[PDB]
Symmetry: D3
Subunit: 160 residues, 6 copies
């Protein structure tokens, strides 16, 4: 089987938790599309061009990952990319109820698309991009949670 | 016993999940008031006049339902309507903690009003008006989750 | 409109939390059947005959309650009692998850039987028959959580 | 890319919910090992030989499934089956909490074995082998939840 | 041991639930700093000066409480106050997942600071400042949940 | 200010997660009593005398810890130890729900005894004595989760 999977999200910014999930996905599937939402409901800290560049640099060492921006329904994107697996990261702090709503709705929209839940290292099980951004805005040390390029970009963003 | 019950909410828009709960309520209580919030904290997609007309058309086949708009505390509304039962729908994806907060506060405000939790069909256990609206805004098929009149109204709203 | 509800459980023994739920049910429905499961699988402390007698005495002040024992499938028992409402009490999330499985299975077995969930007073939101028995087994005071007749029966059983 | 997955459990007996999960697994991976635990600690209704025969008949229509019994540590069994994916099914929050503990322990024992969680159809989201057995023990109809061969075996065991 | 603890939050306004938690904290620790967030993400109903005055009057009977405003990371505040305990109130309706995220992040920022979770009376286990404010805005009786000074201040605020 | 805390449990056997919690407690309070329940109802693997000896050796490096066994109601034991704090560890939501019931009951029995909940390191957030015993029963490596003395005792018990 030549399996194609999508890993959708806002990635605002990509963290070590997201890196852990996409790395695990690359070990089980032939091709992984890290799919970045162009226009989320909440205005992102980083623009789409910034989010894409940061994710590309942070996943450049993974040969079977492609980073792509999208603005449509994640099921419509998977359909157009010929993907049959949608990857979701399940943290210790996940909103399990929302993950159930999302998976059942995604199955209604594209029944041939299977939702696959992967668990990150215990190291990243208790973080989110929102939490990292709030800590960094309040002058806290978040270096451990980010790839080096993201740490540099976040410092630059908060400086101005 | 001549029991009167209220079923409050925003109904923005009314879905098949809400229809399932109000239908179950009509089988156990003599009179059910489907109570639509006039001024919710978050600006609704549909105006109160639209939400009321849609709920009336979608419940017209139920002889013991009355659709009414309200702007006061739901306990104050129940009190003025001589209702002694407040219906809440409990989904598989419900925020059980919030339902507990709400029921205990409603009991403090009107101790003679009993909160009754009803469970929808498995078919509607994983949806919400918010999720349906987000899917439809992103050009997804939500026909299965709505009464026909609501499907028509939602298409018209998103077209403009 | 001649509405009959059934409130099933093990009631080993009946607590003030169960009394709170059955009282709320009697204010809503014309007739409430408090249905006590023989429940041998849970190895109960009190026999079914003891549990029925204790619940009858504890609910004697409520005119529209009838206490009965059963070993049947609960949906068949509700049908045979001409009940169209099955009452369950919700204390917390642990109750909610299992109560969803049970209610969907009861719906499959009897679609016209509606499960209705009620919430107890904050006073009894954190108690169970198991917790009360564990405290009493270790000689802790449980008079606050039980009807008088039940407390004296529990003390006698452990004596 | 010659991907092998293991789907371990007690399967006492295998239900339509388990069939839903193993079917989803076969559409994703080249070969799926449905691994039935001897599980004497849970005092199962069916012997391991019975559970293996029932699951083999219930999954015979799926060409890339292999049913096997085991008493080993599940991470050692996955290694010995050359599996790099361990499939688990998630019905609700109760599953999620325990499944996190299990997956972190399996990762400690075999880091290259990835736990993959799948969600069943809404149809089977509220069932378990325990619930089905409890309904059948009380003579309730469970034909909707089990493969035909399993339903007839369950009726025979309780007869 | 001469222990110093902080009890941080928005306290918008302080309720009987917060009073219950700070009272329990004063019984176990030598000094408790009730720490009020100056600039929360969401605009508060009461200004910082109002929140501080209300908390001071409501805790004046507790000899070992100090009320202080802060705008920095709660871990940075604890560090500067020489506090080694951070008090969190855990309601029946708490977002346990968020409490786990927060405690693990606080431990990353200041490992010598221990998070201590205290449980309020059953009486206040189902309320929040948000719920109290929503009920009061909709003309509901919230007197039972507040200290007298807060009840007076809330009536004045909603009148204008 | 001469503050005494009690940390009660079954500790069958004591794990690195329990050691993490008792260590955090010793940094907060002047004296900590690690209280081991005889707990015959849970049919423990180790006798109470074994559990006390293992915990004493595992906590010998902490100067303000005292290990003791008890069969009493835990609130009565805290009173008799002159403790005003009862320490409990929180790993996840499953702990939280039951810990709320327990803490409200302990408050009813001894209002001046304050329950204090502590969270372990992420390293031990997903372990329990039951999980460690299940892995060891299936010959899986549990050296990472236990003090050296406890690991050797567990291997000997299963041998
Ligand atoms: N620390 C993490 N560990 C594992 N999975 C994660 C982690 N952070 C995010 N994910 C998952 O990755 C996907 C994309 O996440 P997303 O871009 O929304 O980041 P996020 O941290 O969830 O964002 P936000 O905090 O703004 O809600 C989702 O499946 C999400 O659950
Ligand atoms: N799918 C559904 N099944 C059962 N009950 C439902 C369903 N949707 C809503 N309810 C219940 O009906 C009542 C009114 O709901 P409301 O108008 O807020 O819709 P909603 O889907 O909860 O809205 P939103 O998604 O905007 O929060 C509440 O008791 C709610 O829990
Ligand atoms: N304190 C309580 N408040 C509200 N509902 C309750 C309470 N105790 C029990 N119930 C509910 O009453 C029904 C019958 O409960 P049951 O006989 O199992 O008692 P229980 O307290 O849960 O006993 P056990 O601890 O033995 O399981 C169930 O729906 C249960 O959730
Ligand atoms: N209805 C179902 N839908 C999805 N996954 C399921 C379902 N039933 C079981 N599973 C999952 O399949 C795996 C094996 O389950 P197992 O053999 O324990 O069956 P079970 O139904 O949970 O039985 P029991 O009730 O005896 O514990 C687990 O990951 C479990 O969560
Ligand atoms: N009723 C209460 N009982 C116990 N702890 C509480 C209560 N209300 C708040 N707390 C706790 O006190 C601290 C400060 O709370 P905060 O100022 O955010 O009030 P809040 O009620 O949580 O606010 P909001 O409703 O705006 O989110 C937190 O640890 C919080 O969990
Ligand atoms: N890994 C851990 N991290 C934090 N707290 C823990 C951990 N293990 C146990 N605790 C807590 O320590 C106390 C005593 O626990 P107990 O002796 O029951 O151990 P346990 O690991 O839960 O054992 P069992 O699996 O046998 O129930 C409880 O408050 C429990 O929640
Ligand atoms: C069942 C659903 N399918 C969905 N697809 C999208 N797509 C948008 C595309 C853009 N920008 C999006 C926005 C934010 C994050 C992500 Cl990952 C994706 N949203 N959406 C839902 O809310 C529900
Ligand atoms: C204990 C509570 N009682 C309450 N009553 C109301 N009423 C408003 C009326 C309007 N518009 C409302 C707004 C949105 C949805 C609904 Cl269902 C009702 N809100 N409210 C609370 O937030 C809490
Ligand atoms: C869908 C279900 N229907 C069911 N009916 C019964 N009946 C027994 C009767 C006896 N003894 C019982 C046992 C314990 C408590 C109660 Cl309330 C009822 N059990 N059961 C289930 O477990 C599931
Ligand atoms: C991290 C773990 N690894 C484990 N391996 C096994 N193996 C037994 C084999 C037998 N009988 C088993 C028993 C019941 C169900 C299953 Cl799926 C597997 N148990 N176990 C754990 O409890 C934890
Ligand atoms: C790990 C974290 N540490 C944090 N410290 C702060 N401090 C601000 C200070 C101000 N204004 C604050 C805002 C609102 C309530 C409180 Cl209690 C504290 N926020 N914050 C996080 O969001 C996460
Ligand atoms: C409010 C409660 N108080 C309680 N005290 C005890 N004591 C026994 C003593 C023995 N053996 C025990 C058993 C197992 C673990 C512990 Cl930590 C303590 N149990 N108990 C409850 O179950 C509830
Ligand atoms: Mg996110
Ligand atoms: Mg809603
Ligand atoms: Mg029970
Ligand atoms: Mg199972
Ligand atoms: Mg708050
Ligand atoms: Mg334990």
């Amino acid at each position: 089987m030549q399996k194609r999977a999508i890993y959708p999200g806002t990635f605002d910014p990509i963290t070590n938790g997201h890196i852990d999930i996409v790395t695990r996905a690359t070990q089980m599937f032939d091709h992984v599309i890290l799919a970045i939402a162009a226009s989320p409901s909440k205005k992102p800290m980083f623009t789409l061009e910034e989010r894409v560049a940061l994710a590309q640099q942070a996943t450049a060492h993974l040969g079977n990952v492609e980073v792509v921006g999208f603005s449509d329904l994640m099921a419509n994107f998977a359909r157009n990319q010929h993907a049959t697996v949608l990857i979701r990261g399940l943290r210790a702090v996940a909103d399990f109820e929302y993950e159930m709503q999302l998976a059942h709705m995604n199955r209604h929209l594209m029944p041939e698309l299977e939702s696959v839940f992967l668990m990150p290292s215990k190291e990243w099980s208790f973080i989110s991009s929102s939490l990292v951004k709030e800590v960094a805005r309040h002058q806290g040390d978040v270096t451990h949670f980010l790839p080096e390029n993201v740490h540099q970009a976040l410092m630059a963003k908060l400086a101005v």
